[PDB]
Structure 1
Amino acid sequence: AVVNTQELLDLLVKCENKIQTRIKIGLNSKMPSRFPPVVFYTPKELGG
């Protein structure tokens, strides 16, 4: 039902970017350009 709901897929990337934006403004208050996904998506054992 997620793959069928396009409103939920839009909301899912909106909330994912919201979580990533809170991580990024916890890093630096200036919102970056081209922030690497590697710091978010790396597993916790490998540091991410």
Structure 2
Amino acid sequence: NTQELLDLLVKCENKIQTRIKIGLNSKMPSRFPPVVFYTPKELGGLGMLSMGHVLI
């Protein structure tokens, strides 16, 4: 029901992804393929539980 919390969650998800991006490379990319984060931990990926409208 809280809309501001939905916006905040999406912003913070983007912030986490962007910090991973900056750690991985100095220059900020275009269309970093999301399967890097959301892939389960046992399958190599980081395992981000998502609360946003990200389209594969």
Task: State the TM-score, normalized to the length of structure 1.
Answer: 0.89
Corresponding residue pairs, total? 45
Unmatched 5+ residue regions in structure 1? Answer: none
RMSD: 0.5
Q: Distance in 2 between matches of 1:32 and 1:11?
A: 23
**Structure 1 residues 11-44: Cα deviation after superposition (integer angstroms, max 9, x where no partner):** 0010000000000001111110001110000010
Identity of aligned residues (%): 100
| Structure whose CA Rg is larger | 1
Q: Distance in 2 between matches of 1:29 and 1:5?
A: 35
What is the SS of the residue equivalent to 2:14? helix
Higher helix share: 1
Unmatched 5+ residue regions in structure 2? Answer: 46-56
